[model samples]
Target: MVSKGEELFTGVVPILVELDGDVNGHKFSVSGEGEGDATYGKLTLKFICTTGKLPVPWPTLVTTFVQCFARYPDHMRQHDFFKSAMPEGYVQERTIFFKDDGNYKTRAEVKFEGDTLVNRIELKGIDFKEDGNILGHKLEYNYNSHNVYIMADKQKNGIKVNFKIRHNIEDGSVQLADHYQQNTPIGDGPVLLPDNHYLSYQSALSKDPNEKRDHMVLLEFVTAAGIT
Candidate 1:
């Protein structure tokens, strides 16, 4: 149970890189609402996965990053301390045996403001939904992420990457109770969401209404709905 969060991005970013390795066991948080010993009326847990994981392993895209790093050294060295520690590439120069056949696609774009060059290469189909646990709540750590690289200075000055996760929760009032980072190794459980990729949950809690009843009666009502 981590009490506080450290700063993620400290200075200007230089290289386009993935944080897939770091975030697997990265962070945890628990938030509470209200005061005093009030009987809990409802339990709402908003489990947010801070950083997203690659759909597959790292070797798939290692070459593309190394190529980009060579083109943009200042950007890589400026922000990242261990710029050279990264392997040149997983598959290296030998092209016959290796291919980046990852379950992903490339999206490249270029733009300019005034002086420098801008290259925005976004990698798509980068999403994952795995199981995780935080404190007491079971988690379906869902995420739809875009891995983006912003290369500037005619591809010489810098290359910065970021994991932009889509926050599309419908409920506006649910408390952001818990946050967690987990990989499939630690996230050992059945997939909470699959098939149609729809999550439907319903519950009711009553104290004063049920008030001191000898035996509480629980009824199951069926309607024109796909009742789980």
Candidate 2:
């Protein structure tokens, strides 16, 4: 098989997934995917639910959702220069950090072979989905803050989307920024987690994380020239 250089352009930064408390009642999954060019790219987060009641209203769900991956303490390495890599089979000491700020403040640093791969991703946009009986809601992205503020639409229910039901990687601890709000659910009506809140995720694996595990975790891996 012939490997293409451009093909290596697409990489993933693996995320860690861990659930606490009696979460059996709720069925949910998290995943991420990203696409980047030489200068700009966007990562998307997939938080889905199918059955049971959703733990909504509190920022707990969102904070944990983002924190799980952001603070994931593992890194995948490029075993070979010409091949694509997946998160598995390899074990090593690594550190990833999540920042609730601007211009790549939210980042992941993977150390491999005496070198560290530092990847900084930002929250750019978001979209909520809907399924059977659940109402959809709309959320706006803030360029300055990681908090997601809800936008109301009288014609549409505040719920904005559907929970499909569902649900990683590292050896390092997931680092969280102090600026990030702990679990604080506020205001009336439905609330939405901002794109930045889900910034740690944005990848294909994140879109469907339940095939093997209860949650989805992924990261960015790059093979560009002069880039790890």
Candidate 3:
């Protein structure tokens, strides 16, 4: 058996964005906690999508991230990098199709290994001829690393628009092991920090105790492509 002690983004993970061309940067963050021995956990992310620039902002990207952590916990453990540690006969799968009318064929799937899951979001045969000439888009997410890669191929003014963005997990706003438990909601009931003060108080303690602050830390881009 392999060691299961190794895992990614165990606590609050901050992520940053950097654009190649004239685009504004954005901030996205996520928080996760394990139930026991890091096999399972609860997760959540901010819903605010988009920054001041691009059509799709970092917040939008973060929303999909929540799905990876909360929705696909099974497939996540079986990832190529981590699967070796999982016991044999560990597998889970689910797929969702779109449009029964047969016009736009799009679907998403989730497959699991151990107790983690992965997300496969796809867009196909969609009518984008009039709107930016977008051929289609495909997205793949690795939950363990909290990374997402989106490929949006398009054509505009006789030029090929190969738009792609890769979201990486960078170090930011790490929630102390104690802090994660303070804010997580309990069974069918109220949250430990009814006012969400655990985060605020922690932030204040990190900076100046007298001055309240938001604990969010902006994540920076590790690398990017086609968005220049």
Candidate 4:
């Protein structure tokens, strides 16, 4: 992974003038976090596709990175060293891709200020959900990502863009978790009820201690009472 990453970036650096690239932009930004290091620092990058919706095959906006490198050298000599250092299939397997339609917009942000290397990277949808049901769908996600970028020697150069679709049980921000689960149609768990089963949920709520769980009804009563 290091070889590939290094090769891509190093090669890209030289062609800045000819290609649509530069060393500028928040596409790469490192923050001291008043602490220090990637494991305890804040990193953020954004990949944008103003063209037609991003192709499905190349999911994550970060993949634009490949294009960013293409603007550089051909063989990607700059990053070649990483190949010898990286474990087999290291970069390929760890690379992340996030799918989005023209209606979807994506950005990634990472945060790690803890004692452990476990970092957090999130995929945020810039667009509204398909069904427009805030509860049913909305694009926002986060991962307690590990090994997103290689950091060592107490100094890290660049950020690696990667994340897996698998899930961990740790609870996270409501918006972030909702976005992550919304994309992959895993079975809706206790919180989300299917359309047909929606009735069952209502019935179960009828047994609540308050004996009244319908927001619409409750809110209407409140309004009638001039509590609006």
Best by lDDT: 2
lDDT by residue for model 2 over 1-228, one digit each (tens)? Answer: 322321332354333222222221333333322323311233233433332233221122333332211221112112121112111011111111222311111222221221112221222111212321111111111111232222222243221211111111022222232222222122232322222112222223332534433333232222212112
Error of 4 at 219 (Å): 42
Tell me the whole-model lDDT of each prediction, alpha carbons only: 0.21, 0.23, 0.22, 0.20
Better of 1 and 4 by lDDT: 1
- How far residue 177's Cα lies from its native spot in candidate 4, in Å, is 15
Clashing pairs in 4: 2-82, 3-82, 3-83, 6-79, 7-78, 7-79, 60-98
List TM-scores for all candidates, in order: 0.18, 0.23, 0.22, 0.20
Compared with the true structure, model 3 gives a TM-score of 0.22
Give stretches of model 3 more than 4 Å off. Answer: 1-5, 9-39, 51-96, 101-228
Across 104-197, the per-residue lDDT of candidate 3 in tens digits comes to: 2222233333354333333222222222211111111211123222211112101111111222223321211000000111122211111101
- Candidate 3: how large is its RMSD? 19.5
Per-residue error for 70 in candidate 2, Å, reads: 12
- Model 1: how far is 3 from its true place, Å? 52
Q: What ranking of all candidate models by lDDT puts the best one first?
A: 2, 3, 1, 4
